[PDB]
Amino acid sequence: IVSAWEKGMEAARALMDKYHVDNDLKANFKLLPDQVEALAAVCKTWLNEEHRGLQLTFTSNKTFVTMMGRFLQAYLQSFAEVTYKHHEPTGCALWLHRCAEIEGELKCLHGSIMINKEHVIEQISNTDARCCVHDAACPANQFSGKSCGMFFSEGAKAQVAFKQIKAFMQALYPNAQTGHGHLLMPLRCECNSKPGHAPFLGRQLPKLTPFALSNAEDLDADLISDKSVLASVHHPALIVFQCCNPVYGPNCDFKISAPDLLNALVMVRSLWSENFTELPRMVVPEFKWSTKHQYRNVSLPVAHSDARQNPFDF
Ligand SMILES: [Zn+2]
Ligand SMILES: [Zn+2]
């Protein structure tokens, strides 16, 4: 019997040799949990070679390849039976969201229904915003110390994006026994990709934001038979994952839409099948609410101005 580490290393080198990954990346690879670049280079090479015309939608090329890298990593670890405790390789979870089950109703990461709020932007009036229940007494889009950090300026549009992912999954897995109600989502962007990253404030998992597919109705549904595609036609908004705390502490350019995230997983399974004859078991952890994902709030009073020189009359 051989150590799991050596068995992993062999498989990974076979891949890196076959896909002509850079020599330094090859030399330095040690199957360690933060070593994802060489595996992403495998995937990008396979894409360049087999899928040059792949169309991404609200996903950056870098983020798509990085996620394939993590999934490839997870399959290699599973194949070899190597696990590093506290380094789950995908950086993702399956959230049983229940956001497309009841008309007009969204649930947050807590699994509780989201409360309706009016949200005024600048002047735009969003009277259909939704907040985490633990934020129900906060201004719209401000987060309490008990928040999960989820907020939708537009609840109807959010529900369209959840219907879209659920339909996309039903089209890819029309005979699924299980999983059509789960969302594959990232738990880590670049900012918390390492378990000992410096603590940061604000949201503790990648933000989830629905984006409209705005030309998608100028489309003739009758011409399209791809059920995947029809998911977007019927529900023209995508869930898009970005940095834990995107800029409009740390921030990064992580950006991937839910269908492209599932396709990153699916395309790794294809790549794997072209190199190995069985696909190992690989479990993306089911999401469970816990305090580690709680928003890290800091509430600082800010003095309003007063024309007076002195605080008080005496
Ligand atoms: Zn919540
Ligand atoms: Zn980030």
Q: How far apart are CA 117 and CA 153, in angstroms?
A: 9
Quote the ligand 2 centre to 309 CA distance (angstroms).
44
Instruction: Classify the phi-psi angles of 272: left when phi > 0, otherwise alpha if psi is within -120 to 50, otherwise beta.
Output: alpha
- Note the Cα 181 to chain centre separation in Å: 16
The closest alpha carbon to 166, from 252, 231, 88, belongs to: 231
Q: Say if CB 257 and CB 58 are below 8 A apart.
A: yes
Is 99 one of the annotated binding-site residues? no
Burial 20-48 (b: 16+ CB within 10 A, else e): ebeeebeeebebebeebbbbbbbbbbbbe
Q: How far apart are CA 56 and CA 267, in angstroms?
A: 13
Query: Helix (H, G, I), strand (E, B), or coil: what is residue 286?
Result: strand
- Residue 235 tokens read as 């529900």
Strand partners, 208: 241
237-242 and 208-212 beta bridge pairing: antiparallel
Q: Which residues contact 26 (CB under 8 A, 6 or more apart)?
A: 13, 16, 17, 38
Method of determination? X-ray
- Residue 197 tokens read as 């990253």
Is 138 one of the annotated binding-site residues? no
Q: Which ligand minimizes its atom distance to the CA of 136?
A: 1
Q: What is the resolution of this structure in A?
A: 2.0
- Note the Cα 67 to chain centre separation in Å: 9
Q: Which ligand minimizes its atom distance to the CA of 202?
A: 2
Strand partners, 253: none
Quote the ligand 1 centre to 134 CA distance (angstroms).
6
DSSP state, 197?
P
Q: How far apart are CA 303 and CA 314, in angstroms?
A: 22
The full set of domains in the chain, from first to last, is: 1-90+259-285 (1.10.269.10), 91-258 (3.90.148.10)
Q: Which residues contact 134 (CB under 8 A, 6 or more apart)?
A: 110, 144, 146, 147, 148
Quote the ligand 1 centre to 200 CA distance (angstroms).
19
Q: Which residues contact 289 (CB under 8 A, 6 or more apart)?
A: 109, 110, 111, 148
Q: How far apart are CA 13 and CA 98, in angstroms?
A: 42
Q: How far apart are CA 236 and CA 157, in angstroms?
A: 9
- Residue 107 tokens read as 């649930």
Q: How far apart are CA 100 and CA 107, in angstroms?
A: 9
Q: Say if CB 284 and CB 77 are below 8 A apart.
A: no
Helices 4-18, 61-80: axis angle to 10 degrees equals: 140
Q: How far apart are CA 248 and CA 78, in angstroms?
A: 39
Strand partners, 157: none
Is 110 one of the annotated binding-site residues? yes
Strand partners, 30: none
Q: Ligand 1 being an ion, which residues bring their Cβ within 5 A of it?
A: 108, 110, 132, 148
Q: Which residue bears the tokens 């992912």?
A: 165
Compute, in degrees rounded to 10, the torsion defined by CA atoms 60, 61, 65, 71: 30
Is 243 one of the annotated binding-site residues? yes
Quote the ligand 1 centre to 250 CA distance (angstroms).
23
The closest alpha carbon to 214, from 187, 232, 231, belongs to: 232
Quote the ligand 1 centre to 289 CA distance (angstroms).
9
Query: Helix (H, G, I), strand (E, B), or coil: what is residue 306?
Result: coil
Residues 103, 284, 29, 244, CA torsion sign: positive
Is 191 one of the annotated binding-site residues? yes
124-131 and 151-152 beta bridge pairing: antiparallel
Quote the ligand 2 centre to 277 CA distance (angstroms).
36
Is 304 one of the annotated binding-site residues? no
Q: Which residue bears the tokens 């979870």?
A: 93
- Residue 53 tokens read as 């015309």
Q: How far apart are CA 298 and CA 300, in angstroms?
A: 6
Q: How far apart are CA 183 and CA 179, in angstroms?
A: 8
Q: Which residues contact 153 (CB under 8 A, 6 or more apart)?
A: 119, 121, 126, 129, 140, 141
